[PDB]
Structure 1
Amino acid sequence: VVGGTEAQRNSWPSQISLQYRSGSSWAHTCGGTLIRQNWVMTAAHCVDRELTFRVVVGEHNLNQNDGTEQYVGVQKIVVHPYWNTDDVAAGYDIALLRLAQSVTLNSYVQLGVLPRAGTILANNSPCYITGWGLTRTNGQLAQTLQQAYLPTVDYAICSSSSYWGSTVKNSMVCAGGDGVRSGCQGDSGGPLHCLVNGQYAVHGVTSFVSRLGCNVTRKPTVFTRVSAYISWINNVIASN
């Protein structure tokens, strides 16, 4: 996250770190949202590489003992059947991970609540992106969970020529684009949290930023629109 602030330890208890095996260590690659005690929602592009994955819940600092972490292997990966790795602009950038164990819920570990199906946020709806992604374009991962205030940019504006043009779809949510704050590499798969009727819900799964850089004016961060995938999600969990 570029231009973020450090999240308090208990603000975003559904945020997870998706990690892969590198040597005999694990390295953070992507964010995710805990949606069942044994299921995580992330971005399809995060799980294209044939890698060993683990999920960390109750994670705050990637390189320090928080005293709150649970570490759980990924047992099954279900990527959206329509996802095409060579065509992120087509959408469908979403995947579900079944965990090898069911995690224990507490103030640091909670299920993320999803919006009602078909819900579209009004232009300029206030949201926070969260994650451990790069803090600068071509920079380094954050050590501690970051959050940034990123207001939505509706489809009409986001798909206009100054913005993302034909690249963005109605299956996506754009947020931010002020040139100061944004998602960045390593935030992919993580949540966009938006307050609706007094409660946060996870409206986005972080998908992409400009190839020109993370925080680029009129290139808001783009997210898979969660409310487009409600029946897909439920169908996968009910059959697995």
Structure 2
Amino acid sequence: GGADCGLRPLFEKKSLEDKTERELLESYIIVEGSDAEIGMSPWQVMLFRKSPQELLCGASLISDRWVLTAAHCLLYPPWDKNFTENDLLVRIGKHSRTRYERNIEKISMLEKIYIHPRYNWRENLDRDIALMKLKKPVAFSDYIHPVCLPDRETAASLLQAGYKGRVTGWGNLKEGQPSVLQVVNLPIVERPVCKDSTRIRITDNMFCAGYKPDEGKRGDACEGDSGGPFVMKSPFNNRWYQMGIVSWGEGCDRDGKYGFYTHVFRLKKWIQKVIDQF
């Protein structure tokens, strides 16, 4: 699925708007978040461990058989983390964090995991991106639907300082756990400001987002949210596009710090190549 990407069965398709999307549109020229609405993020996926039944990370559905996430969720040697297809399963269509959602969610097994060959776990998580092929295609529904991948022009016009994106996840609410999927809208921050907030070498394959100390508003992703989608709604065709992947941050919601995200468009060629070959 991809011709109908970014159009939510319970919102766009019915001409209904969610509680906070206007905030995103008005800016075009999870800690401190809120409960998501049912069907608000139908591409949200839960990365899950089979052994101790645990939430590992968030992820997103980009087609009936492909899930996108952060590579650190799968491979992070400094913490002795190195998962294979058989160590995980994906849960699509969820709202409740712990509750197994009978008749609503779908569970899939992984066929193959592809980690960007130049993923830099040794230093700054440069190119923190991974693709996962589902063993069997997932059937879409009101709660399951793929998000679109950005094209050059969508990335050009939307990825600007001040423009707000949206992050969703079942991660920690503070640096305990939410009962349902949380959502927070955050503004993209100027690259210089991102660089000057950390000692870590940031690259062109990343962007940071969050409110500045003087802005009053707060919000950020936290443990459990990584691998999840940072999305924006295009004001041109009204579809939702995944601009980033929750990558890293120093703590959660700390003043003067910002969440960092993988720049999806810059790595789009690797995505296309992988899906076109495998």
Give the TM-score normalised by the residue count of structure 1. 0.90
Determine helix, strand or coil for the equivalent of 2:260.
strand
The one of 244, 248, 271 equivalent to 1:204 is 244
Verify: 1:132 aligned to 2:161, yes or no.
Answer: no
**Identity between Structure 1 and Structure 2 (%):** 30
Contact 1:158 1:165 in 2 (8 A): no
Q: Which residue of 1 aligns with 2:193?
A: 157
Residue 117 (structure 1) shift: 3.5
SS at match of 2:82: coil
Q: What is the 5 A alignment of 1:1-240?
A: 1-23=30-52, 26-48=53-75, 49-51=81-83, 52-66=87-101, 67-87=103-123, 89-117=124-152, 119-120=155-156, 121-137=159-175, 140-159=176-195, 161=196, 163-164=197-198, 167-178=201-212, 180-197=218-235, 198-210=238-250, 213-240=251-278
Provide runs of 4+ in structure 1 moved above 4 Å: none
Give deviations 1:112-163, integer Å, cap 9, x for gaps.
11111472411111111100111100xx33231100111110223212x2x2
**3-state DSSP of counterpart to 2:67:** strand
Q: Once the 2 structures are TM-superposed, how far is the Cα of residue 220 of structure 1 from its aligned partner?
A: 1.3
Structure 1: give runs of 5+ residues left out of the alignment.
none
The alpha-carbon deviation at position 178 of structure 1 amounts to 4.2
Q: Could you say which structure has the higher strand fraction?
A: 1
Shift of 1:169: 1.8
What letter corresponds to residue 176 of structure 1 in structure 2?
A: G
Q: Which amino acid aligns with 2:247?
A: S
Aligned-partner residue type, residue 136 of structure 1: K
Q: Secondary structure in 1 aligned to 2:50?
A: strand
Q: Deviations over 1:160-187 (max 9, x none)?
A: x2x2355322211211144631000111
User: Is the 2:72–2:125 Cα contact (8 Å) retained in structure 1?
Assistant: no
Deviation at 1:206, TM superposition (A): 0.4
Alpha-carbon distance between aligned partners in 2 of 1:30 and 1:166, rounded to the nearest angstrom:
23
Could you list the runs of 5+ residues in structure 2 that have no partner in the other structure? 1-29, 76-80
Partner-residue secondary structure (3-state), 1:238:
helix
SS of the aligned residue for 1:153 comes to coil
Query: Which has the higher Rg, Structure 1 or Structure 2?
Result: 2
Q: Aligned in 2, Cα 1:131/1:236: closer, same or farther, shift over 3 Å? A: same
The answer as to whether partners of 1:56 and 1:71 remain within 8 angstroms in 2 is yes
Partner SS for 1:201: strand
> Counterpart of 1:5 in structure 2: which amino acid?
S
- Give the TM-score of the pair, scaled to structure 2: 0.79
2:148, 2:239 within 8 Å by CA — same for their partners in 1? no
Q: CA RMSD in A?
A: 1.7
